[PDB]
Structure 1
Amino acid sequence: GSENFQTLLDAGLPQKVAEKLDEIYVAGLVAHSDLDERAIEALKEFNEDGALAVLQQFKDSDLSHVQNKSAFLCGVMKTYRQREKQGTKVADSSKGPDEAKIKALLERTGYTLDVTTG
């Protein structure tokens, strides 16, 4: 991993967040200090899902010649909340399809003259 794994654990944030953050600091996706104190502060008070949401998109952001990764990260945190609570803006984003598998239910059969069986 990277040295920045352990700061997160001590800054207030759970392991389950840092486990999904270390990857970013190893992929070549950041320059270790690609963020600023202001982007840290808005990344102390989150819930369990919160940071995971923000870290996800950030791994797939258009970063190739960004000048300020902090602006990007302090952006995405202010949209995902729309699927979390009534505490954000109407911003755009593109997640959570249609579609839903059964996976918990079962079928039936009843051979009789009244039923469209095979």
Structure 2
Amino acid sequence: GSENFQTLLDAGLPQKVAEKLDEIYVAGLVAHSDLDERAIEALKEFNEDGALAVLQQFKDSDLSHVQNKSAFLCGVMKTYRQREK
């Protein structure tokens, strides 16, 4: 992977999540610095398959009409912890 990979691992993430997430910074979408600390924290408040779903669904969105790249991810994250029906 890239520059971001080693930082992401050290930002508390499991390897499985860090692997996918690094590539989001490689492909000219978002910065690795684009997040708020509330995202860095709420990221550890997921399990592996938790976070991996969030990463997929965040990629399976449209980052045309975004600005606040953090708040966008923060939105998807809320949806995933808020799954009671």
TM-score (norm 1): 0.61
Structure 2: runs of 5 or more not aligned: none
Q: Percent of aligned pairs with the same residue?
A: 100
Shift, 1:68, TM fit: 0.4
- Structure number with greater CO (CA < 8 Å, separation at least 6) is 2
| Partner Cα separation in structure 1 for residue 65 and residue 79 of structure 2 | 23
Shift, 1:80, TM fit: 2.8
Q: Between Structure 1 and Structure 2, which shows a larger proportion of helix residues?
A: 2
TM-score (norm 2): 0.81
Confirm or deny: 8 A CA contact 2:8 2:22 kept in the other structure: no
| Partner Cα separation in structure 2 for residue 34 and residue 60 of structure 1 | 18
Shift, 1:54, TM fit: 0.9
SS of residue paired to 1:20: helix
| Partner Cα separation in structure 2 for residue 79 and residue 65 of structure 1 | 19
SS of residue paired to 2:72: helix
| Partner Cα separation in structure 2 for residue 18 and residue 44 of structure 1 | 12
Shift, 1:8, TM fit: 2.0
Shift, 1:76, TM fit: 0.8
The count of residues paired between Structure 1 and Structure 2 equals 82
Shift, 1:27, TM fit: 1.1
| Partner Cα separation in structure 2 for residue 3 and residue 74 of structure 1 | 23
Structure 1: runs of 5 or more not aligned: 83-118
Shift, 1:11, TM fit: 2.1
Larger radius of gyration: 1
Shift, 1:25, TM fit: 1.0
